[PDB]
Design a protein around this nucleic acid. Structure first.
Ligand code: MG
Length: 750
RNA sequence: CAACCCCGUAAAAAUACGGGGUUCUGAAACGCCAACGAACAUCAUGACA
RNA sequence: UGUCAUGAUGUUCGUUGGC
């Protein structure tokens, strides 16, 4: 009854609750808790790799006494390429203190050690009683800065509906009206209620008096109209309170679905008849003239609203760690992490509510209850939501631009050359003149590079992840260029062919010719072409647009490859994290042989377990015997050395680093999966990380790889055998057709 | 696109095929991705006391 | 050096398409 295929229901329930339950809601909740750590580990590993790539290799009192770790710290912190991370270590164009940077690095190391599983297994869930006094101060200072910032930025953006909401409520404090509207959209008091007000207003919208807001001419404003009726309702219930409670009891005591609608039906018609006049009065204020006039005056409101804000309120310590992680990333990664966390915590809240509804045990163990309950989860969900809602410009400072210039010219030519030549070209290109000034009327290269490479997120991603010394080789191999261009859809390909046409090519609508010419023009690009940017005649505009397009395409091509390789490696990191996690639950320790780790022992152990054989993924029954036989056959073709090497490769993210030594000999590309596995197989073959004495079938795999210049499916099936205990995961991670969910190709016939 | 469990007709094998489930299986779907759009902050251009 | 026009760059919202 509700048992899982992995046969860890009892173990998981005992670990998290303490006893076994005969129902199917507890594990339903536990999977979200298990989901949080996966994404946290992925992003922490990415951050650690970034720190390693950009910077080539008791309390604070003990640090000075060591005299050796002190030397490591003094030089590691002073390295000037800390400027590549925006606010991690520099504040107001000034360096942060050594204690704060030490605190940030130590917290990152502790989080990495926690996720990749000395710190206890309960570290993240108990920060009040484990964190030292020094780190808490640094987190507090960071949150003080950001809370001053959010106080500033809030009042400026949404000061168009704020005026109307303050106006519609004469008998209310200026502070109070702002309080609830921050309680409304920045952090949702909308969501945390048993009504579906979105559906409710639709039922109100079914009432006659307010069809007068459904006119076609009102299409100019919808979002700034839909929300306004939304906020009034969540303010209408707050004042009445008892009526809100009355509707709670009536719905909870309602019988059937027909009873649900009728309760909604009569409630809505009372609502329109109650305060419909406010809806008409509010909805009559929106127009082009009023909106423009309201935007003109943006300092008529002066509200601090500091006290109950978590900036001054005792914000949780778990959210400050998330903000510290956020400091060291870009927009997409932050959005991914925050969205996943909000979804998971919302699901946890809903599930615990469901458990309480049926009068069932819902308290966790004493170790976990301090964090996992209704109130603390609600608070931490609100904190994560407010962390997500921060506007960032991330302009590349004003001092860091010099190293930016150096690396920016290093990518566009001048690969692996001494800095003296770089400085010489810097001086000869854009002169200074006398007194360290800038030659007016003769500086156009600085503007082009600064506004097209320096201030681009793609360049920051490449600098964080790719070495500027050896980045040019990613575009030298034609096949990779054609594959990446073919991945890009049709419309912007057509736009790029049009803009960067030239004068010696005839118009063609064929996409193959377009890809060919784009590959040809992107193969040979140098800094010397960019030496004639028009200073300050349609030819000048056309030339400027063509230069913008050609510099954009290059970085796009590099960035796509880097991102997709990181993404595949993160998918494999999830797999190893889950494997290490599941090894502890099942109690099967991983011993060492010849200074290695045998990652293939979990599947061997589960191959000979009666309970797993009878009620698990690997089944030995008449009619259900595919994967048992296939896994048993594939287990006999695994190299322990190769598996250990693969584990190290994915742990260190070596595919992104050493991609310049093996991307020059690939035959043909059809998916990023085969590129990734060709790179890893080439690295393993060149490093001689195999043993033919213990397994003589690796020689044929290497020979096939050499004679075909493409990855061998048998080898990827070989070094992924530790994933044998989950059949869907093995299928997804070893079969190309099932790795990507955007490919409708069926599974190949065997 | 794949796995898992029920109810059907033939069958004993590495069982096909026809209906309904699954957050209690793995794939970012409360997500990515483009082009039209509205505000906003940036950088470069002409009119002036 | 503020203002008015004039074009580029990136976010943030919503429509419309595609995964
Ligand atoms: Mg799941």
């Amino acid at each position: 009854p509700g048992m899982d295929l992995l046969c860890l229901k009892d173990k998981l329930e005992m670990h998290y609750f303490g006893k076994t339950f005969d129902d199917n809601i507890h594990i339903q909740l536990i999977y979200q808790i298990l989901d949080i750590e996966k994404i946290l580990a992925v992003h922490v590993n990415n951050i650690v790799f970034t720190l390693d790539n950009v910077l080539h290799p008791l309390d604070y009192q003990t640090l000075r006494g060591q005299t050796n770790k002190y030397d490591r710290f003094k030089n590691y912190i002073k390295r000037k390429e800390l400027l590549y991370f925006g606010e991690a270590f520099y504040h107001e164009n000034e360096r942060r203190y050594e204690e704060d940077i030490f605190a940030i690095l130590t917290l990152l190391s502790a989080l990495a050690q926690f996720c990749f599983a000395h710190v206890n297994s309960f570290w993240l869930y108990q920060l009040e009683d484990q964190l030292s006094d020094e780190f808490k101060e640094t987190l507090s200072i960071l949150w003080e800065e950001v809370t001053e910032r959010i106080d500033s930025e809030f009042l400026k953006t949404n000061t168009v509906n704020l005026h109307i909401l303050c106006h519609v409520f004469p008998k209310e404090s200026k502070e109070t009206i702002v309080r609830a509207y921050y309680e409304f959209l920045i952090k949702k008091s909308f969501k945390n209620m048993g009504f579906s007000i979105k559906k409710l207003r639709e039922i109100m919208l079914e009432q006659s008096d307010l069809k007068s807001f459904k006119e076609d001419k009102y299409n100019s404003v919808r979002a700034k109209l839909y929300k306004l009726f939304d906020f009034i309702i969540t303010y209408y219930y707050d004042h009445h309170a008892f009526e809100k409670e009355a509707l709670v009891s009536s719905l909870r005591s309602s019988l059937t679905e027909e009873n649900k609608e009728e309760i909604y039906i009569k409630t809505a018609r009372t609502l329109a008849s109650a305060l419909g006049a406010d809806f008409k009065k509010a909805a009559a204020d929106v127009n082009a003239k009023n909106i423009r006039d309201y935007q003109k005056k943006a300092n008529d409101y002066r509200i601090s609203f500091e006290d109950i804000k978590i900036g001054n309120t005792g914000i949780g310590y778990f959210s400050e760690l998330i903000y510290m992680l956020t400091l060291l990333l870009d927009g997409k990664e932050i959005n991914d992490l925050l969205t996943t966390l909000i979804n998971k915590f919302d699901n946890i809240i809903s599930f615990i509510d469901i458990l309480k509804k049926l009068n069932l045990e819902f308290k966790f163990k004493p170790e976990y209850a301090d964090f996992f309950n209704m109130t603390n989860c609600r608070y931490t969900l609100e904190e994560l939501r407010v962390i997500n809602s921060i506007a960032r410009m991330q302009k590349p400072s004003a001092d860091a631009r010099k190293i930016m210039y150096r690396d920016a010219l290093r990518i566009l030519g001048m690969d692996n050359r001494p800095d003296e030549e770089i400085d010489r070209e810097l001086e000869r290109t854009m002169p200074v003149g006398a007194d360290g000034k800038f030659i007016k009327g003769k500086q156009g290269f600085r503007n082009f590079i600064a506004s097209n490479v320096i201030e681009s997120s793609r360049f920051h991603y490449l600098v964080r992840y790719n070495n500027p010394h050896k980045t040019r080789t990613l575009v030298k191999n034609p096949n990779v260029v054609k594959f990446v261009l073919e991945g890009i859809p049709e419309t912007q390909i057509k736009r790029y062919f049009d803009v960067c046409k030239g004068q010696e090519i005839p118009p063609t609508s064929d996409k193959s010719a377009q890809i060919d010419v784009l590959a040809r023009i992107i193969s040979s690009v140098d800094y010397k072409i960019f030496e004639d940017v028009p200073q300050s005649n349609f030819s000048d505009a056309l030339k400027k647009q063509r230069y913008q397009a050609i510099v954009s395409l290059y970085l796009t091509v590099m960035y796509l490859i880097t991102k997709n390789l990181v993404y595949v490696n993160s998918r494999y990191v999830i797999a190893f994290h889950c494997l290490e996690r599941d090894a502890f639950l099942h109690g099967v320790t991983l011993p060492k042989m010849n200074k290695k780790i045998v990652y293939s022992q979990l599947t061997t152990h589960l191959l000979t377990d009666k309970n797993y054989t009878t009620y698990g993924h690997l089944k030995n029954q008449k009619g259900h015997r595919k994967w048992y036989v296939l896994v048993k056959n594939n287990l006999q073709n695994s190299d322990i050395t190769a598996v250990s090497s693969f584990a190290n490769i994915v742990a260190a993210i070596s595919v992104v680093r050493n991609s310049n030594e093996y991307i020059s000999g690939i035959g043909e590309l059809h998916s990023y999966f085969e590129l990734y596995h060709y790179l890893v197989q080439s690295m393993i073959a060149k490093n001689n990380w195999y043993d033919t004495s213990h397994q003589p079938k690796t020689a044929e795999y290497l020979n096939n790889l050499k004679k075909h210049h493409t990855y061998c499916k048998d080898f990827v099936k070989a070094y992924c055998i530790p994933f044998g205990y989950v059949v869907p995961r093995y299928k997804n991670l070893t079969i190309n057709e099932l790795f990507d969910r955007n490919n409708p190709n069926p599974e190949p016939k065997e």
